[PDB]
Amino acid sequence: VLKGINFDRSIVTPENEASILDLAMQNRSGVLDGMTIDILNTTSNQLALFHGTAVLQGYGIEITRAAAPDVLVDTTGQSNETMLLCLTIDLNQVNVPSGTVGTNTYAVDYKQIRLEFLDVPTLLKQYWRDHSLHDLIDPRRVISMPLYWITFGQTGTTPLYEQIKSNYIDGGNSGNPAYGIAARCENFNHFINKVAVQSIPINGVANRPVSSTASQLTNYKVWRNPYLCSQDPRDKFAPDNLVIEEDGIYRIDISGSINIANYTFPASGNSWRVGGRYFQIVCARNSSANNLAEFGAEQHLPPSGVWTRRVLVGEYTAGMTEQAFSSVATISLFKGDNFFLQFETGTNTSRDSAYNNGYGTSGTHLRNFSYTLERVGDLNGTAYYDNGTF
Amino acid sequence: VLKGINFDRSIVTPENEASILDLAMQNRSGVLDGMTIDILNTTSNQLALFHGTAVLQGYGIEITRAAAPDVLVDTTGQSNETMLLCLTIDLNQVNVPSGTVGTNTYAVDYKQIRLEFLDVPTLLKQYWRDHSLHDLIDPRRVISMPLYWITFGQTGTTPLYEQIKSNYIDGGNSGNPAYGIAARCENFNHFINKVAVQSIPINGVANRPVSSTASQLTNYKVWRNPYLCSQDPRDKFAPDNLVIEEDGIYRIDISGSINIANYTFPASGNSWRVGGRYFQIVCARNSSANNLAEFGAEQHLPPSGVWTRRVLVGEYTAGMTEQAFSSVATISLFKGDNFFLQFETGTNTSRDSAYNNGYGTSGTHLRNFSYTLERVGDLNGTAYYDNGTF
Amino acid sequence: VLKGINFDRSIVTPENEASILDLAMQNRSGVLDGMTIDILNTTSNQLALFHGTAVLQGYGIEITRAAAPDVLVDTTGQSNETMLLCLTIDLNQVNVPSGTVGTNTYAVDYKQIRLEFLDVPTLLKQYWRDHSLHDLIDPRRVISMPLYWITFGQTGTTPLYEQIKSNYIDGGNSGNPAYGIAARCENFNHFINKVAVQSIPINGVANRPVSSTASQLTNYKVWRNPYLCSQDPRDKFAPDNLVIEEDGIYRIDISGSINIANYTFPASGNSWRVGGRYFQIVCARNSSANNLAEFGAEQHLPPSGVWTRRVLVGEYTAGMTEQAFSSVATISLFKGDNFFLQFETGTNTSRDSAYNNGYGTSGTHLRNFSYTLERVGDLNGTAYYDNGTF
Ligand SMILES: [Zn+2]
Ligand SMILES: [Zn+2]
Ligand SMILES: [Zn+2]
Ligand SMILES: [Zn+2]
Ligand SMILES: [Zn+2]
Ligand SMILES: [Zn+2]
Ligand SMILES: [Zn+2]
Ligand SMILES: [Zn+2]
Ligand SMILES: [Zn+2]
């Protein structure tokens, strides 16, 4: 029958308002404030955490402050292991109330909530990002959120820790937690290698032209949303590739210029005319490598016929020292994909190349180059096939 | 007096949390999951629907699963008619509870909820998109959401069905249901007709250059959000025009290049110089035709002085074989409007035309052309006049 | 201990659903409908306001309609002063219920809610935009939202009023209240002054080329979201500068063309070649002046190393009459900052200038110029340092 949830005679239940808060959170779970490690109160038998608030699939969880230590987690028996400190909801457990709402003594022992140590495969099997308490097809009773990588040493030592920033809603994303910017950078200058195909380094290090003969690897300001993407973990691909952590339709914006752009000089033989040289800037996706996503999670397989390369800018050099370009596109990306940008031209400098024979500032380079990658849509349901192939 | 809704001594009512869920839904109503037709359990006297969840102006509605058939709708008396299967809320009705919260027997017969067949004019008069239970000026007691076009044949036959996808929150839009992408496409190539003004086909079919003498109508990947826009229903305008289904401020992104671009050849008579040829790419809106919106609904009239054409790219050809362009603009669009893109140039190929005299690959064409149309703002209240004219 | 908020044995409190509604409002407070001044029922002793709804840090406030006047505020004792009419929540007060839920006589005198007159410094000390009832570090018990600037004259006169539009969620922003468009304009034409550095007027008045010898100051359609930005209050900077009212990551889109663009004419001395002229379009931020934000509020100080200028377009003129450009960038902006756009070129018209020696339509100018400024991300927590410098 047709059942009302929010109607005059309805009873508003706990799952109901949890389902409402989950909707209000754009189906994202995470720590809203605090819940960071407290090293001062951390020993070889206990791990301490500061007070804070978290939302796990619409259920509000709080670590209360008093007097510190705000909370203590038992580390006894954990040694010579890398574990995940997890916040877990277990709906098979029973919450035990005590006292009364009449007196001012009502209290609850929330046995449905746990702070625990799990190994990577156990967490993955009950990770909120892949499974749900509210799931249509496979509804779960136990769900977890990883907070920290905890590396325990020998018995009697305090452990090493690494925050799982993808599970903390810190800032930059308040208001649109499941969307917004994935990656962005400030303007940078990058030397064009004398090759037909090359990636543009989008991860914070560019080969900056410094003199008339030399270029040097120089850092530039870059930012990544750890919930949406991360720098490739393999050092071969780390300067150029992003790993996508979340499926969706993304917008890619690029702008910059090609400086010291090559062309065929106007001479009497070519009727005093500029011979333009073809170049293109492409964005690309690649899913050949599995397990690139956080925790080595299984990649989300793209639909059949999915794109791999897309031209953003395709034109000829125009005989000027510097020529500007700009491009904006929406593209489908999948969890576990590599995402990168490529510059493409011919290799014959006297005939078809957009680059010259010079080096450093005297050689062809990208100048004032920048990009923004933003999640703008999801790939749930029908969209996966209708919108996911391009 | 100043009344509190969420305060210590307040009583949180059903309309209250419905108003909260409606806000959390960005004032969009629709089926969240399931509620699709069940043909196997559909006869000539009954129409079956699968289990699912829907939100109608903040009221949660559920069709429960058990044993199938999840729900049955009476089709007796319906013959030789095209009807709308609607989910309706009727606040004039009384919900009948039974049993008790003490025993485990509390149940409700939600007579305020109906699955029914309505004709187009009846649905339009109580459609959630145009009228509201929460409305300030004209508050309603009965509101409906159309789910399927149901075409009943002769007495004794099973009917034909067409899903009303604008009223299903399937995917691509979870998290920002009233906004996001309206339309997007992959890169395509389109031959420029030897005319002064022409539309660029944005609906999935382009006139692709295939040989040195010929171009052929070729499909390209395109996607449309049915809640925001649809392909024009008139075949004359179907390859080029979108119909806007929702008012708002939209962002239009375009990029591509003009290939085999025409110019005046450098000769001794013009001092060995390139004679550039003017062209422009414009976006346009037109509201002369009423009833283009879904169900033939009345168009929303734009404010006085509203724009009709906007230049996105305006420049000269530069003497190169291929020249890239890009443009991004925010524009106001109204429910019932036609939206389209136009390429504009001169008609004299030896003097002012951006196009040449060739055909197919030998003729001037758009190459790597793509666009994204996105809803980025609404036109409610004051914005209608301050932001709605451009 | 781990406390549940939305769990089976939990008690859902007023602060809880207020915290839920605040999240659903993207942490924005404001009037949702009505609450505008009622001049007809306004005397020299009372100020009247129409019925309406407002949300203040998740608490729903309503002014009820009956018979008018919907509400009356005591103006006795207020004379020869500019005051702020404020809606205030005071959690130190006690809400007084009466009657019973059994009979149909339950009512509450919400003493925690006040409509009052405050001076600018008092409002600033308890303004919702800077302080919170839900705040982690400095939780407050009293918070206010300014609705109108009320200027009282001599005793016996009705006052003058100015609506505080930043605190009214009117339209354009329903669904994404804390984000969306900050500023946008229609295409305009603007004469390039014969200087090295100049601002592009983004506030609705351009110096439009009208004849072969003259340009004239002409209005163009522009829109600003008062919650996000305002026109600079100092007349020296009013045609060009915006004041940012809210911190965040913003997207800036620009497009247009440079018409009657200057270049070195091809002659026998330069081997019949076009000598390109360098120009750049930059966006800029400046925080040297404090108190530019609404109510003269203290500016939010940017992180150390913050950007001040960013190149959007950097290239040479290409020998054509008109050359198009486009650019999209994400930038950090802070409350109290000035934001503006600059056109930059050389000053020698016979050597390095992108502009010529002509005036009006015969002189170099921006044609079909437009922009969109949009808030796309916040700068809360860690983002302030990681994302706030660029
Ligand atoms: Zn649920
Ligand atoms: Zn996954
Ligand atoms: Zn976006
Ligand atoms: Zn309401
Ligand atoms: Zn309508
Ligand atoms: Zn948008
Ligand atoms: Zn709170
Ligand atoms: Zn402030
Ligand atoms: Zn945005």
Model description:
The structure is a homotrimer. Chain A has two domains: about 170 residues, Phage fibre proteins (Triple-stranded beta-helix); about 220 residues, Jelly Rolls (Sandwich). Chain A is about 5% helix and about 40% strand. Chain A starts with a strand and ends with a helix. Chain A is mainly beta and about 400 residues long. In chain A, strands 13, 14, 18, 21, 24 and 26 form a six-stranded antiparallel sheet that branches. In chain A, strands 15, 19, 20, 22, 23 and 25 form a six-stranded antiparallel sheet that branches. A four-stranded antiparallel sheet of chain A has the order 10-7-11-12. Bound molecules: zinc ion (9 copies). One zinc ion binds next to strand 26 of chain C. Chains A, B, C: This is Putative phage structural protein. Chains A, B, C: Keywords: Metal-binding, Zinc.
Bound molecules: zinc ion
Tell me the number of strands of chain A: 26
Rg of chain A, Å, rounded: 27 Å
Tell me the fraction of residues in β-strands of chain A, as a range. 35-45%
Shape of chain A: elongated
Helix content of chain A: under 10%
Largest sheet of chain A: 6 strands, antiparallel
Oligomeric organization of the protein chains: homotrimer
PDB class: viral protein
Keywords: phage receptor binding protein, Lactococcus lactis pellicle surface saccharide
Assembly: trimeric
Entry title: Structure of the RBP from lactococcal phage 1358 in complex with glycerol
